[PDB]
Write a protein that binds this ligand. Structure first.
Ligand SMILES: *[C@@H]1O[C@H](CO)[C@@H](O)[C@H](O)[C@H]1NC(C)=O
Ligand SMILES: *[C@@H]1O[C@H](CO)[C@@H](O)[C@H](O)[C@H]1NC(C)=O
Ligand SMILES: *[C@@H]1O[C@H](CO)[C@@H](O)[C@H](O)[C@H]1NC(C)=O
Ligand SMILES: *[C@@H]1O[C@H](CO)[C@@H](O)[C@H](O)[C@H]1NC(C)=O
Ligand SMILES: *[C@@H]1O[C@H](CO)[C@@H](O)[C@H](O)[C@H]1NC(C)=O
Ligand SMILES: *[C@@H]1O[C@H](CO)[C@@H](O)[C@H](O)[C@H]1NC(C)=O
Ligand SMILES: *[C@@H]1O[C@H](CO)[C@@H](O)[C@H](O)[C@H]1NC(C)=O
Ligand SMILES: *[C@@H]1O[C@H](CO)[C@@H](O)[C@H](O)[C@H]1NC(C)=O
Ligand SMILES: *[C@@H]1O[C@H](CO)[C@@H](O)[C@H](O)[C@H]1NC(C)=O
Ligand SMILES: *[C@@H]1O[C@H](CO)[C@@H](O)[C@H](O)[C@H]1NC(C)=O
Ligand SMILES: *[C@@H]1O[C@H](CO)[C@@H](O)[C@H](O)[C@H]1NC(C)=O
Ligand SMILES: *[C@@H]1O[C@H](CO)[C@@H](O)[C@H](O)[C@H]1NC(C)=O
Ligand SMILES: *[C@@H]1O[C@H](CO)[C@@H](O)[C@H](O)[C@H]1NC(C)=O
Ligand SMILES: *[C@@H]1O[C@H](CO)[C@@H](O)[C@H](O)[C@H]1NC(C)=O
Ligand SMILES: *[C@@H]1O[C@H](CO)[C@@H](O)[C@H](O)[C@H]1NC(C)=O
Ligand SMILES: *[C@@H]1O[C@H](CO)[C@@H](O)[C@H](O)[C@H]1NC(C)=O
Lengths: 357, 358, 358
């Protein structure tokens, strides 16, 4: 033919063979695994045990997936009497006011005192209650702060369980395909001679005893392998004719050119004339290309979709506490009633009165 | 034979073949990947870097899994005033004495009240500032706790995508690894030898197959003949031609066909040849043994999961309502307004009346 | 040859075959799955709806991975008392004047105390109400933070199961994809042609096969001959010059057997035929080359993990003990019991005695 390349392709046919023994262990066993989350995820600070209980039934589901695998003097007396009458009346009136005012003062100062006493007592109780509310808030705040770190670690260990459950899930299927290879070799090798090369020994198979082994079957295949390979120009196919019309194609062996064309088998360079036994008439060089390919996809780029900051900004609230200092004034500077020592000066007046006595 | 269906089965046997070239790339390479968790999970707000540090050694373990891949009387009048004077003078001292004692007593007490107002006020101011100190710190500590949680929810969210992406990189890696066994198999059963099995290197049979190394995997330009026009004939699942199944003949290396009586043929060509002991291995007397066998895989991701979130949340959730309390207080100090002390001015008027009266 | 074991190896060669039918379903379909994370992870208390929004694009990425799949003296007598009276009268006003000044001074001061008590009390009430406002809001904000965390633990709990279920749906999808290659392989090397290899379609060789499309995958009914009673004979791995080996004969297309001397036979039948150049490709002089090779996979999920939780928690954990404090206070406002003002009543008696005396 005249394919994409020239008719000439060069092949190495096998001149001599040597016997080859291959010992192979195809593994067919992976012990099933039970994940006890309270133990694997933690079992340490019991804070983890309680915290995991809130976490959920993750353990049940992960295990489901894995289980799948004279008269004037008298007038002077009257003058004294008039002075006395005025003085006596005045003394009582001033004293009467003194009595009224001091009496009024006593109730008022006492009223002030009770007021001071009551306010202080209530003040003490309110503050203690302020302490009670504030004290509990702090402890409740502390459990909330301490719990979070135990929460971040539990979540961290759980991220490793999901990845390890994935490794155990991928290892289990991988072994399962391996048992189909092992079933296949047992049927197409131990129980029969296998035409396909490379499926039990390099070169063809002349037997294949198998034995069971610790987790999987160990097969001691035995067969011949090629040793020295002769090389000859050969034709992809010989369209015998002057360019394409009707053509001959090698069947069971490449068509080779001696050192003209002569047929040979794949096993041995055994030149034999090209005859209708070795050829199935192929078409007139209808060489049909059929490109086909096999592919897989990779998705874990290191960066990820976006930077953390943009993602955090759409939902994050920077949140600044409106810290406040409760407003207060020390307006009660003093109540220093003073110079009451003038009462001592009034006492000096009493001393003059005592001297008058 | 008389199998589950009638002896008749219709087979299309090849009449003319045409040459065919397949160019095939079997991929045998996936770069191993290293996950830098501080960078993948963040490297952004450093809040993630500190927060992830508490998160743990998740990075180390995930990497292990991925790395796996009348003168006297006048005197008596004076004596009468003098007796009034004796009583009055004594009375004046006593009233003044009480006045001195009371005002003195009042001064110490009012001053005692003053210290009391002063001390309580000062202590009150200090306690409040401390109330502010404790309350102020609590709020800031509360704020870090609220702000940290959102950064914590996002870190967990990015980590959930890593476990799924480490799983895709783990599944892709084994999938390529089986693919290299196909590539090893084709290299051994195709490039290095002619392969009897059809469909393993070229449609139809194979007459050569040169491999070449390619960017990540081997590229094989296999060449072989493919069937082009297929003739069709009634054929028999194999039968002795005998009336009653005592023993029967089974086609070997080719189907048995009926011409337009029975004649043998190969799989490659409708080359009729008489049925002879060369083409047949004697099969048993119609012991047609059925053997149903099947291959299955399981689907587990139903959209809704085991239970609704609310029931799951209720068994452990506490609705939790803060027992908010307003500290109880009373404004009982309505007033201390001593008033009508103006009567002291009235007393002053009384003093004024007798001042200069003598 | 003289391989690791002795030349002798015992083989069972088929004597009679019986017809065998296998019905096989190779599954080639796994419906693709779309995960609605708001529904799967939550759908419940809308707290899980809003909280998940903080988690971010976990849903988008997981979906990408899954989508990948004497007359004068008398006047003087009274006058001398009157002279004392003149001082006494003036003194009485002077004492009263002090009384007026002091009581006036007291009034302003006691009123100064009154304002002090009133102002402090009012301010005290306002500050406390504000203490209640700040403390009250903190508690409610504390409550949302505690309540949100439990919804956060459960949402993160359900999200952990999604990562494992997305991994099972991802592993099932590739596993089906390899299965379609088996199905493509059987269709090309079985339904479209007779297959030399045993095992690909029917125990024993294959004499025809018909596929038929089935609910999710192809159901192939295959028919072929299968061996029934197998004769056993001593056979030789290979046969040499029956001496120190110079060159040897190796069975080709069939084992070499010893009768009850050596005689060749095919794999299909114990048909003894003399060893001849047709059945032997000359092998080398017992160059028996061993080539040990094996297939292995690795297991990583030991129950324990790298370290106990406590050590891991300790390196980063802060036990954190709240410095709870009780704001310091003193109840020093002892009763200001001004008392014994009853002496004012005693002073009143003094006035009464002289008012009567007048
Ligand atoms: C294959 O054929 C092309 C087209 O004639 C030719 O250019 C090329 O030299 C041939 N192959 C090689 C690599 O020699
Ligand atoms: C290969 O076979 C030939 C002919 O039997 C023989 O001359 C040669 O020694 C053998 N060995 C080698 C070197 O391949
Ligand atoms: C040569 O090939 C041509 C087509 O390029 C064809 O038409 C012609 O018949 C062929 N010649 C012969 C007789 O082989
Ligand atoms: C990491 O991501 C950056 C940006 O996509 C890229 O430049 C770099 O090559 C990536 N490395 C790997 C090995 O993925
Ligand atoms: C919050 O504000 C600070 C500056 O006070 C800034 O540095 C920080 O990045 C902000 N946080 C956010 C919104 O990421
Ligand atoms: C003061 O009064 C007392 C009691 O009436 C009296 O005994 C005494 O003599 C008086 N003293 C003077 C200074 O006259
Ligand atoms: C197939 O080959 C035969 C024999 O050469 C020939 O008679 C027949 O016409 C060919 N058919 C086609 C499709 O050319
Ligand atoms: C989702 O799961 C439910 C069972 O929980 C099932 O009935 C339904 O078909 C699934 N898909 C849809 C369409 O919601
Ligand atoms: C909490 O109580 C409110 C009001 O009764 C209710 O609407 C809400 O669903 C409850 N949350 C839960 C599930 O505890
Ligand atoms: C002041 O308030 C108290 C509260 O107990 C009340 O008993 C008292 O009568 C009030 N005084 C005035 C001035 O009304
Ligand atoms: C009375 O008081 C007035 C005003 O201070 C003064 O002018 C007068 O001298 C006083 N008289 C006597 C003697 O007390
Ligand atoms: C096998 O067939 C032979 C005749 O070919 C017969 O004698 C024998 O009974 C059959 N049974 C066995 C041993 O499989
Ligand atoms: C015979 O055996 C001896 C020792 O193994 C060895 O030196 C000699 O080459 C052998 N001859 C052959 C080829 O049989
Ligand atoms: C499981 O746990 C035990 C606890 O003693 C430990 O010794 C063992 O290594 C772990 N591995 C197994 C058997 O899964
Ligand atoms: C924290 O302190 C408590 C009380 O001392 C102790 O029992 C607990 O184990 C500590 N937790 C850790 C691991 O920090
Ligand atoms: C005061 O003196 C007056 C003089 O008329 C008299 O009526 C009154 O009863 C006296 N009061 C007392 C209690 O001394």
């Amino acid at each position: 033919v005249d394919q994409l390349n020239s008719s000439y392709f060069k092949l190495s046919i096998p001149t001599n063979f040597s016997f080859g023994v291959t010992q192979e262990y195809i593994q067919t066993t992976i012990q099933k695994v039970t994940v006890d989350c309270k133990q694997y995820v933690c079992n340490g600070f019991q804070k983890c045990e309680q915290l995991l209980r809130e976490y959920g039934q993750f353990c049940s589901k992960i295990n489901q997936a894995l289980h799948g695998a004279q008269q004037v003097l008298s007038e002077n007396q009257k003058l004294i009497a008039n002075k006395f009458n005025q003085a006596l009346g005045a003394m009582q009136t001033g004293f009467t006011t003194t009595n009224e005012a001091f009496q009024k003062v006593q109730d008022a100062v006492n009223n002030n005192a009770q007021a001071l006493s009551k306010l202080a007592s209530e003040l003490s109780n309110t503050f203690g209650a302020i302490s009670a509310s504030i004290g509990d808030i702090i402890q409740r705040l502390d459990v909330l702060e301490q719990d979070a770190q135990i929460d971040r670690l539990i979540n961290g260990r759980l991220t490793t369980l999901n990845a390890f459950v994935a490794q155990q899930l991928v290892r289990s299927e991988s072994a399962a395909l391996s048992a189909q290879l092992a079933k296949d070799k047992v049927n197409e090798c131990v129980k029969a001679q296998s035409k396909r090369s490379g499926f039990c020994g390099q070169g063809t198979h002349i037997v294949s005893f198998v034995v069971n082994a610790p987790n999987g079957l160990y097969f001691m295949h035995v067969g011949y392998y090629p040793s020295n390979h002769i090389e000859v120009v050969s034709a992809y196919g010989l369209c015998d004719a002057a360019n394409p019309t009707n053509c001959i194609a090698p069947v069971n062996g490449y068509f080779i050119k001696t050192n003209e064309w002569s047929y040979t088998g794949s096993s041995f360079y055994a030149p034999e004339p090209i005859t209708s036994l070795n050829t199935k008439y192929v078409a007139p060089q209808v060489t049909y290309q059929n490109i086909s390919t096999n592919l897989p996809p990779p998705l874990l780029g290191n960066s990820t979709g976006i930077d953390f900051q943009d993602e955090l900004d759409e939902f994050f609230k920077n949140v600044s506490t409106s810290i406040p200092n409760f407003g207060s004034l020390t307006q009660i500077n003093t109540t220093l009633l003073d110079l009451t020592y003038e009462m001592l000066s009034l006492q000096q007046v009493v001393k003059a009165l005592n001297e008058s006595y």
